[PDB]
């Protein structure tokens, strides 16, 4: 009666499953078709990817389909706007296939390959062509959730995505100029026929959000469900000013030196050297306004004090929590606890320490972090190593598998820059010996 | 150089306070005055009152200034509707008086009493008020966040808010009836020179959110800040549906019947009991579609097997980390940490145990946990003694000074009815004896 078992990698109690002679699997919420609605340069691609990119980190299996990329496989090269224009009967034809062809690939991602979101990044300006996305959901069971981005020419024009646009590989074989005039012209083709979202009358009964001039205002129609709310939570959170995140781990600490994991242990005479020299760096990247932000153990608060600068302590920044095997090393772990040993590095990401912490547990703490981070302008983050790689897996694209395997090496800032559809990452060592405390896949 | 103290409470690192001989003390970002706007019954008391429970209890300090409540104090006795004439003059006059008074109180509670953010509830309908109010604001150094919440008139008589509205202290010698003919008399005195946010035009520098018809749309124009986009979060979170909320403890643990603190232990016998009794009382509330949530640790789970019910299991509602205090008994703290004991007595809620928590942890710990119930309907939570404790806080308004004191006993349900602003509370035990966990404050 009542009767559980810990499972081995996670820790997770579950009924014990006396399974009978004939074991029977029940093999395998509604997903979700986010459709991207507006004219092109409207920041449609940006907020899809940014998007997928925070749901697949907190969990969500989340996949971007672009019509403009099963229309480039279609299609071998691109030579102008011509493509695009209304009174083009065959590339209408074309076009129409391709967005045809990417919901096929929707459906077999959210029914069958265990996908929860697909985001439907197209222009999807005409009520014909959202009535058959709508018609598409509803005989698959799948949830539908409009996301429109409304700009006006100048402010599109100001915001410089246009760049980004023209660097697509339509315009391979172009020069800036040419790309530009190109591109301006196909908005043009658009126009006629785009039909905003109404929510006042014909889209009355659809959930949906519309993004005014790059955020400046949101309109919000039936938010159905936690994600649908989520994603207007981070919507409202995320900006396009320019900034920079600067990411390092405390400066070495005396359990460093002694291979230790966890613990509360202070700076060696190394870990100052490399605070002292944090301290110079920073001076000379001239910053406005740098918010520095450390967590509540002592080796990153020493290395935060050697900047002469205020700073903000996070609990949510502490080191992954090693539960029984806090303070030890790993050839005391390997022989204390044999089992567990194997069972992390063969699973380390879901493996949990007993009365401990998995990579997973880290991600679910840090997401308020990466919510401020986006939020944030100028950022300097002193950090430790497993809670490093999961900011560094959000800011990268990189996946759970590979989170925990990330190289961030001691006495070394990574800088990231936001760049196009994403960040760019410069190190900089700051030239202070310490130990290493990588350890690369078994 | 580098030199660092825990502190003894909060275990918080700080650098080593050498004062001088003369030791100066530098005392004491922005304040926000939140500007309710709307016809009356249109819902802003309800939600002043939820924003400020919500507010408070995730640690910032929040007050709702009420302009009738000025009313009622300066004016003995409510008569009629005739008293919101705009042709009586007289009443006019008191009623801006009133408004300037709580204004004068906003200003002390944000410049001077340590207030964070100040909740200004009334109609603050025409565009004269509101310029009055920003002005007020500008000149205090405070940010104005508006929120405007519109109603037709078939939305607000179906959403029966009108009879929480006519149970006000100025309808105490009337019958229901009455009451009811007065507060429509009321409304339609506002209606001639109501001028709603305009943030197409007139409103559109303003940082504000639009709740039209019980949220089924959100105008949101120019959110600043972390707090701002935080409430229209929760604005999107919150509904007004019929529900009910279940909070008990797993059942007796063997951890119990020793006195000791945290740990993994299983059901007693007792609890065993316990768990086939909810089962019992659960079949009998004979409820839709419950929802049951328990912690990651196994007596919550064991408990939850007991009702033959799926269940979800939250990480965040293990109980308290009693760190280097976990499964010793309350004797063998005080043998053994004397001072760790006598601090925890004398400073409960902040009070940090060593590689520990404190319940300022569970509260940050708790926030996503709260803003799902707010989403969901009927739910059973099977929780611990202090997650128990933070959750009542939060549908009781409890302080925090207090909520570490709250009485939540084993084997006893607490159910959770929402009436008009707040939570009516009963408590209901299955008749199974446990030990007491309770320790009163010394
Ligand atoms: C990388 N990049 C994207 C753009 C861009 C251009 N246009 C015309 C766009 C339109 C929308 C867009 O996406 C968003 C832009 C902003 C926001 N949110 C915000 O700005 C929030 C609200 C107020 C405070 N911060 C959310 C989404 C991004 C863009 C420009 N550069
Ligand atoms: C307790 N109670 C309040 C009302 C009430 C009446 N009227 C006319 C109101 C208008 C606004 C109001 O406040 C809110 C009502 C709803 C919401 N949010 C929501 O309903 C979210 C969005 C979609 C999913 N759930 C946020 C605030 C509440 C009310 C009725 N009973
Ligand atoms: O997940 P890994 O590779 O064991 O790294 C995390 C460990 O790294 C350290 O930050 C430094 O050794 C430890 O405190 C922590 O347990
Ligand atoms: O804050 P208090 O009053 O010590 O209660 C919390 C304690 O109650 C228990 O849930 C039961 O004794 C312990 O596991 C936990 O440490």
């Known amino acids: 009666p009542l009767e559980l078992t810990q499972s081995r990698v996670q820790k997770i109690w579950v009924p014990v499953d006396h399974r009978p002679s004939l074991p029977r699997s029940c093999g395998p919420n509604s997903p979700t078709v986010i459709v991207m609605v507006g004219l092109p340069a409207r920041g449609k691609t940006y907020i899809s990817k940014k998007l997928t990119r925070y749901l697949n980190w907190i969990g969500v299996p989340t996949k971007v389909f672009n019509v403009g990329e099963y229309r480039r496989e279609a299609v071998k090269q691109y030579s102008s706007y011509n493509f695009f224009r209304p009174d083009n009967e065959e590339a209408m034809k074309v076009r129409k296939q391709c967005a045809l062809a990417a919901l096929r690939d929707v459906k077999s991602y959210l029914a069958k390959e265990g996908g929860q979101i697909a985001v439907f990044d197209a222009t999807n300006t005409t009520r014909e062509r959202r009535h058959m996305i709508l018609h598409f959901a509803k005989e698959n069971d799948f949830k539908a959730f409009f996301i429109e981005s409304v700009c006006d020419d100048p402010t599109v024009v100001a915001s410089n995505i246009m760049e980004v646009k023209?660097?697509?590989?339509?315009?391979?074989?172009?020069?800036?100029?040419?790309?530009?005039?190109?591109?301006?012209?196909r908005i043009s083709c658009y126009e006629a026929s785009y039909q905003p979202l109404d929510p006042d009358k014909c889209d009355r009964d659809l959930s949906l959000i519309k993004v005014i001039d790059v955020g400046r205002r949101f309109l919000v129609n039936r938010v159905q469900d936690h994600i649908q709310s989520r994603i207007v939570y981070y919507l409202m959170n995320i900006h396009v000013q320019p900034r920079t995140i600067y990411l390092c781990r405390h400066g070495e600490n005396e359990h460093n030196l002694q291979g230790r994991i966890g613990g509360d242990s202070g700076l060696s005479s190394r870990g100052k050297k490399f605070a002292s020299a944090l301290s110079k760096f920073v001076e000379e990247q001239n910053l406005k306004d740098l918010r520095v932000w450390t967590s509540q153990l002592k080796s990153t608060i020493q290395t935060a004090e050697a900047l002469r600068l205020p700073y903000e302590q996070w609990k949510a920044l502490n080191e992954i929590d090693a539960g029984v095997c806090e303070e030890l090393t790993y050839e005391e772990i390997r022989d204390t606890y044999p089992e567990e040993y194997a069972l992390?590095?063969?699973?380390?990401?879901?493996?949990?320490?007993?009365?401990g912490e998995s990579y997973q547990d880290l991600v679910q703490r840090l997401e308020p972090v990466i919510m401020e981070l986006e939020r944030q302008e100028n950022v300097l983050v002193i950090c430790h190593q497993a809670v490093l790689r999961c900011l560094l897996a959000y800011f990268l694209d990189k996946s759970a598998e590979e989170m925990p395997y990330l190289k961030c090496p001691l006495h070394t800032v990574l800088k990231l820059t936001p760049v196009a559809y994403g960040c760019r990452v410069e190190s900089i060592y700051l030239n202070v010996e310490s130990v290493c405390t990588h350890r690369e896949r078994s």
Do not use: G, H, L
């Open 344 to 355: 992390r590095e063969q699973d380390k990401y879901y493996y949990r320490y007993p009365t």
């Open 166 to 185: 023209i660097s697509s590989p339509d315009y391979k074989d172009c020069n800036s100029a040419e790309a530009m005039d190109d591109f301006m012209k």
